[model samples]
Target: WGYGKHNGPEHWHKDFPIAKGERQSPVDIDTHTAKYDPSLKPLSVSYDQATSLRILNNGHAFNVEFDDSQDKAVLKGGPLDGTYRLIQFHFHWGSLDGQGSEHTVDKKKYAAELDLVHWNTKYGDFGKAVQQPDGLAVLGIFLKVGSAKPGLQKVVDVLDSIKTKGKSADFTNFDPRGLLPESLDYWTYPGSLTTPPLLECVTWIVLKEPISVSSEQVLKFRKLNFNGEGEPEELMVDNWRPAQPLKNRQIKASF
Candidate 1:
């Protein structure tokens, strides 16, 4: 399903019943209620610049696919049990500079959101990993409107090439590590994939510190179209799902 009135997240439960299930994702993080857990270890990330495969426009959002054959890029510790290999990363943004992020903090929304998807190696491949409880680990980084981020500019530079659905190009030498904020402090909770299938298998690690992105840079993402060549054009904007219920989940903070 797409992000329209008849096919948006509001109507996802009809196709994927788990969309309304307990432990769904993109929750509005209530900072006051989040408990700081001393037991939580510092998050670790080691990425290989060469692991970047290509960037594609999937009609939803632009995604930078990674070479996940080995543990070239991995995320460990924090609220996770074992090491998870980075698969791909994508962004969700709005049409305007006002609101776009999926996860909110104290009801505060950011201009955009970046999701770095990883799969637990313990579950073998990403296909099998997504089926288990602690299978997937998604690192969510909020993007606020501020100074232009040089690291992010690398990705934006190629947007014009893949401006329509199903278009992809070879992308390499892009290290995702440079895109992270200075601090690793984050909120952890059990959540689901924000998109369809809505599988409740993700252990979301949403960073509290947001990286900067200028308004002009964010507008470049809107240049992409949901439709491919020869079809009616629909700008790929507001490609974020609304926050779901926290349910019985507790957000733990790692200071």
Candidate 2:
């Protein structure tokens, strides 16, 4: 089912049983109540200057996938045991200007959320790693509307080439590191994927600082077509999942 009135997140549980799981993602990060852990090591992210392969629209959201056959790009430390290879990065947004971000702060939402996906190397491959507890690591970067982010323009410029599902454009040599904020400060927690097949294997690390994006730029992303060619055009918007409950979970902050 599509992300609409007929069938969306609320209806996902009919088929995908884990949609209501306790350790689900996109939780409201209550900063005041979040515990600060000095023991949490600094996150180490080393992205290869040329790991990006291509950009595609998988009907849900646009994704920039990398060549993960090797360990050229890896993320370690920060509540992790071993290196996790970068596989791709995607985003979730809203149909309007006021809200979109999945993870909120003090109940306030942002314009969007960017997810950098990586799989633990100890599990050999992403397919296998997704089944283990400490298998996947996703870096959630919040996007606020303000100054135009030049780094994101590179990805936005290619949206015309892949406006529909199953479409892809050759994209390479771009460093995902350019999209991150100046501060590495973030909140850590254990949660599941915010999408279908919502596996509870991700160790989420959401940055405290949000990068800027102009309203005009965000509108361009919403112009993306959810349906493929020869069908009624549908804009890809409001793709964010609602924040889940934080039952028995602890939100740790690394200042």
Candidate 3:
């Protein structure tokens, strides 16, 4: 199912039973309730821009895929067990500037959310890593509307090349690290993928700081179509899923 009213997050449980599972993702981050854990080490991220392969509109989100054949780019420490290789990075945005972020802070929504998905290298490949708990670590960064962000201009400039579903264009030497905010402070918890398959394998590392983007930059993403070429044009907006229950999980802060 897709992100429509008839088949959206609320209806996902009909096909994917895990949608109601204990550790579902994109939970509201109640900053007042989040615990500060001094034991949590700072997150370590190293990226190789050359490994960026291409950007594709996969009907859901525009993902910039990377070559994860080796440990060229990866995330470590924080709440993760071992090194997690960078697989792809994508964005979830809204048609308007008021709201769109999947995970909320004090029930506050941002203009958009960026997910840099990584898979545990201990599991060999993404295919296998997705099936095991603690096998995926997604670095989530919130995007607030303000001045134009130079770091995101490159991705925005290439959107026209992949305007429809299944469309793709070569995207080389683009480092995802530039998208991050200066501060590495984060709130982490055990959770599942925000999208379908809804696997409870992700160790979410959501940054406490938000990066700035322009209203024009966010509007560019709305031009993307969820439909394939020659098909009906459906704007790919509000692609973010609403926050889920935090359940019995505790959100640890690395401040």
RMSD of each: 0.9, 0.9, 0.9
The per-residue C-alpha lDDT of model 3 at residue 245 equals 84
Ranking, lDDT, top scorer first: 1, 3, 2
lDDT of 1: 0.92
Report the C-alpha lDDT of model 1 over 159-214, residue by residue, as the tens digit.
99999999999998898987899999999999999998889899999999999998
Stretches of model 2 off by over 4 angstroms after superposition: none
TM-score of 3: 0.98
- Per-model CA lDDT versus the true structure: 0.92, 0.92, 0.92
Clashing pairs in 3: none
In model 1, the worst 10-residue window by lDDT is 44-53
The TM-scores, one per candidate, come to: 0.98, 0.98, 0.98
lDDT by residue (tens digit), candidate 3, 15-109: 99999999999899999899999999999998853389999999999999999999989999887788999999999998888888999999999
**lDDT of each residue in 17-55, candidate 2, tens digit only:** 998988998899999989999999999998854489899
